[PDB]
Amino acid sequence: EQYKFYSV
Amino acid sequence: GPHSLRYFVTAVSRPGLGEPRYMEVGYVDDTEFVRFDSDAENPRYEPRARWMEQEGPEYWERETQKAKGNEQSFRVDLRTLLGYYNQSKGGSHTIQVISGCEVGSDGRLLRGYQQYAYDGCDYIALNEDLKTWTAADMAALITKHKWEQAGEAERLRAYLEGTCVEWLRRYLKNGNATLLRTDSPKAHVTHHSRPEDKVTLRCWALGFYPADITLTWQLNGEELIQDMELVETRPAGDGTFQKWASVVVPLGKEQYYTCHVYHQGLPEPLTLRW
Amino acid sequence: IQKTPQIQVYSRHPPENGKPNILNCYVTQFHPPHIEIQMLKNGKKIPKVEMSDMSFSKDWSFYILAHTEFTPTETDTYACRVKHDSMAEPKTVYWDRDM
Numbered sequence: 083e084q085y086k087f088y089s090v
Numbered sequence: 091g092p093h094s095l096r097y098f099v100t101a102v103s104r105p106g107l108g109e110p111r112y113m114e115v116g117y118v119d120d121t122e123f124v125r126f127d128s129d130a131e132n133p134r135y136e137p138r139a140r141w142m143e144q145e146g147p148e149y150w151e152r153e154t155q156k157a158k159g160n161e162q163s164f165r166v167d168l169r170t171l172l173g174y175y176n177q178s179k180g181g182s183h184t185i186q187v188i189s190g191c192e193v194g195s196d197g198r199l200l201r202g203y204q205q206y207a208y209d210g211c212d213y214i215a216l217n218e219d220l221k222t223w224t225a226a227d228m229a230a231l232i233t234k235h236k237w238e239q240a241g242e243a244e245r246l247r248a249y250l251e252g253t254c255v256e257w258l259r260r261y262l263k264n265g266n267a268t269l270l271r272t273d274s275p276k277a278h279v280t281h282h283s284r285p286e287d288k289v290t291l292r293c294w295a296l297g298f299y300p301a302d303i304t305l306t307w308q309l310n311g312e313e314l315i316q317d318m319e320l321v322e323t324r325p326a327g328d329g330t331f332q333k334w335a336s337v338v339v340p341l342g343k344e345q346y347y348t349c350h351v352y353h354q355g356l357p358e359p360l361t362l363r364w
Numbered sequence: 365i366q367k368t369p370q371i372q373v374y375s376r377h378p379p380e381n382g383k384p385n386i387l388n389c390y391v392t393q394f395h396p397p398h399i400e401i402q403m404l405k406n407g408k409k410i411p412k413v414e415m416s417d418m419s420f421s422k423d424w425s426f427y428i429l430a431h432t433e434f435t436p437t438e439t440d441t442y443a444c445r446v447k448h449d450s451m452a453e454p455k456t457v458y459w460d461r462d463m
């Protein structure tokens with residue numbers, strides 16, 4: 083499963 | 091041996107042509123197994139290896155929702171970076187992320203990682219300790235500070251040590267017949283004339299898995315690694331790999347050169363001549 | 365950071381006329397990501413073509429595979445044509461059966 087990315 | 095779960099993420103803006111193209115490709119070792127491409131009709135997370143048929147519909151629904159959320163985040167990232175770097179709104183830019191984990195034969199974590207690139211250069215990366223980030227420039231330092239104040243490394247650490255490891259274990263269990271197999275390389279040597287009384291001997295290795303392999307040319311029992319040309323190990327379209335390595339030798343001395351092939355599927359390395 | 369693609373063309377198995385095989389066009393070490401790749405049979409675009417194995421190296425350059433099933437005939441010529449910002453004109457690399 084993939085990671086939940088937030089933001090830079 | 092050890093195994094790995096890796097995701098390659100890319101967001102590429104296209105000023106004047108709509109929203110950025112967003113793509114996610116997942117791998118277990120050298121086998122592509124999942125993919126999301128915002129450019130398709132009704133983009134959804136899709137299986138890329140047969141054993142992924144073992145996941146239920148909920149897997150695909152949840153991963154699709156995550157990918158869409160991820161797509162929005164990177165779209166926002168692209169905009170944000172334009173500001174950090176003081177760039178125009180009309181150029182195309184790229185954000186890339188490599189994320190994943192590796193476990194030993196016993197399924198325990200060996201290491202986790204996540205590295206970002208902006209326009210093909212290092213931007214920010216998680217340190218091996220899984221507790222701090224390293225910024226490549228002053229823009230990335232803005233991100234580092236935001237992430238530190240938001241407890242982002244702690245969140246990521248939980249994913250790498252938990253979710254990543256557990257799912258990798260599950261994928262290796264479900265796809266054991268594919269992921270834990272060994273396909274032995276089959277070799278052959280080609281010969282091509284050249285000007286100045288020389289010939290090119292090319293050693294080929296085909297149909298092998300995993301991708302890791304070693305090809306060397308020897309003369310006098312000593313490897314020639316230096317004056318030999320080669321291509322990087324490459325996928326062959328069916329889950330296997332191939333590679334070639336060549337050396338230029340004097341016409342009439344070909345029999346003095348031998349190609350050696352070392353691979354997990356070769357109990358004894360292959361030795362070949364032309 | 366604009367890198368020109370390496371274009372490699374090869375079949376899964378040593379070629380045998382009339383025997384199903386797989387033709388590959390691996391495009392690597394390129395940047396930016398935008399690129400157009402097409403496989404051709406006797407100069408005409410092959411419709412089947414699957415794109416797979418997209419990845420990037422440690423220096424971030426892009427890699428991707430175009431592949432299709434094919435049954436070569438003695439007179440058929442196959443090639444791969446690539447269009448990338450790093451080049452003026454599209455580059456075509458031919459399949460060399462005896463390489």
Ligand SMILES: *[C@@H]1O[C@H](CO[C@@H]2O[C@@H](C)[C@@H](O)[C@@H](O)[C@@H]2O)[C@@H](O[C@@H]2O[C@H](CO)[C@@H](O)[C@H](O)[C@H]2NC(C)=O)[C@H](O)[C@H]1NC(C)=O
Pocket residue numbers: 144263264265266267268270
């Ligand atoms: C791969 O593993 C299977 C065992 O099944 C696996 O575990 C399940 C829970 C699920 O994750 C499946 O998708 C997996 O395939 C092996 O098949 C078993 O082999 C035993 C003997 O060792 C046999 O008695 C059982 O009947 C088999 N089980 C089933 C469900 O058919 C299989 O041999 C392994 N393949 C390779 C190449 O190692």
Ligand SMILES: *[C@@H]1O[C@H](CO)[C@@H](O)[C@H](O)[C@H]1NC(C)=O
Pocket residue numbers: 176
């Ligand atoms: C951003 O670039 C513009 C020119 O395009 C320049 O006038 C301005 O000083 C720059 N801003 C900063 C903070 O460097």
